[PDB]
Design an enzyme around this catalytic site. Structure first.
Site, short mmCIF file in Angstrom:
data_model
loop_
_atom_site.label_atom_id
_atom_site.label_comp_id
_atom_site.label_asym_id
_atom_site.label_seq_id
_atom_site.Cartn_x
_atom_site.Cartn_y
_atom_site.Cartn_z
N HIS A 40 0.81 -1.27 0.00
CA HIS A 40 0.00 0.00 0.00
C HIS A 40 0.83 1.30 0.00
O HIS A 40 0.25 2.35 -0.28
CB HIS A 40 -1.15 0.06 1.04
N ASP A 84 0.04 -7.56 2.11
CA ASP A 84 0.46 -6.16 2.18
C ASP A 84 1.99 -6.05 2.39
O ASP A 84 2.50 -5.73 3.49
CB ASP A 84 -0.48 -5.24 2.97
N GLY A 175 1.89 7.13 8.37
CA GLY A 175 3.25 7.53 8.06
C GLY A 175 4.24 6.51 8.61
O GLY A 175 5.39 6.64 8.24
N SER A 177 3.47 3.44 8.26
CA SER A 177 3.12 2.30 7.42
C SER A 177 4.28 1.96 6.48
O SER A 177 4.99 2.82 6.02
CB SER A 177 1.72 2.26 6.73
N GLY A 178 4.56 0.68 6.32
CA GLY A 178 5.73 0.29 5.58
C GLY A 178 6.88 -0.09 6.48
O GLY A 178 7.65 -0.95 6.03
C1 LIG Z 1 0.07 2.93 8.30
O1 LIG Z 1 0.29 4.15 7.93
C2 LIG Z 1 -0.91 2.72 9.44
C3 LIG Z 1 -0.92 1.49 10.12
C4 LIG Z 1 -1.75 1.27 11.23
C5 LIG Z 1 -2.69 2.24 11.56
N1 LIG Z 1 -3.61 2.06 12.59
C6 LIG Z 1 -3.32 1.54 13.78
N2 LIG Z 1 -2.12 1.09 14.10
N3 LIG Z 1 -4.28 1.44 14.68
C7 LIG Z 1 -2.63 3.48 10.95
C8 LIG Z 1 -1.80 3.72 9.87
#
Ligand SMILES: *C(=O)c1ccc(NC(=N)N)cc1
Ligand SMILES: [Ca+2]
Length: 223
Positions: A40, A84, A175, A177-178
């Site tokens: 993603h 993912d 942010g 994420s990854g």
């Molecule tokens: C990635 O940007 C991401 C992953 C996980 C979440 N949510 C939670 N950890 N609750 C937000 C954004």
């Protein structure tokens, strides 16, 4: 990172920042030329930034290497976020040193209760928007599959695990994420999704890295 601490410059050497004019996702250096991130986070025009602490200032130790190809997993499904996972090839090899180093892949999956380290330059606010300059860190245990499922009924595949706190106040967020979930020295998870950030009963959900070891190795070996 919501509820974490500043890590300390260069202490998480495999941490990478994915950048297209601003930081948009993280990833992990798993070898001198290949970074793992989430499918993603995919976009074109990505510059991988290694050896960063403050992402707004060049402080030294940084290596800005463009992506020469990104390989989204073939069954990645954007509606569920299953599979993912993505691999980025760097256009040149990174100079590994004490400030830029790669993280090991796992030889087996981690059990519930394992404590891991999540790091990222994502949002620090649960209700609101606050991006940090420096890298943030958070220690967090992998939760049982029972609890993961009872929090996200019908949405957990066998390629995901939940980690974090049911009380709320501590989780990964936009942010992050990854980026990596490291357990006893190995890369076990990839920051993938969750509901909100840091909400009680809605832990973070992570790409289950150990189920992908063979794919990564094979993919990398032919590219
Ligand atoms: C990635 O940007 C991401 C992953 C996980 C979440 N949510 C939670 N950890 N609750 C937000 C954004
Ligand atoms: Ca910097």
């Amino acid at each position: 990172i919501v509820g974490g601490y500043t890590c300390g410059a260069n202490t998480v050497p495999y941490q990478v920042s994915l950048n297209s004019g601003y930081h948009f996702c993280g990833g992990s250096l798993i070898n001198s030329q290949w970074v793992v991130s989430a499918a993603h986070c995919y976009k074109s025009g990505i510059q991988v930034r290694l050896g960063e602490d403050n992402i707004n200032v060049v402080e030294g130790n940084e290596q800005f290497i463009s992506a020469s190809k990104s390989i989204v997993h073939p069954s990645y499904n954007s509606n569920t976020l299953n599979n993912d996972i993505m691999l980025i090839k760097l256009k040149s090899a990174a100079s590994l040193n004490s400030r830029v180093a790669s993280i090991s892949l796992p030889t087996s999956c981690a059990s519930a209760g394992t404590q891991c380290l999540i790091s990222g330059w994502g949002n620090t606010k649960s209700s609101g928007t606050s991006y940090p300059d420096v890298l943030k860190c958070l220690k967090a245990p992998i939760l049982s599959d029972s609890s993961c499922k009872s929090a996200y009924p019908g949405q957990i595949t066998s390629n995901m695990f939940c980690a974090g706190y049911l009380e709320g106040g501590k989780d990964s967020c936009q942010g992050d994420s990854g980026g990596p979930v490291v357990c006893s020295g190995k890369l076990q998870g990839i920051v993938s999704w969750g509901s909100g950030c840091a909400q009680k009963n809605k832990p973070g959900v992570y790409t289950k890295v150990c189920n992908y070891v063979s794919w990564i190795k094979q993919t990398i070996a032919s590219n």
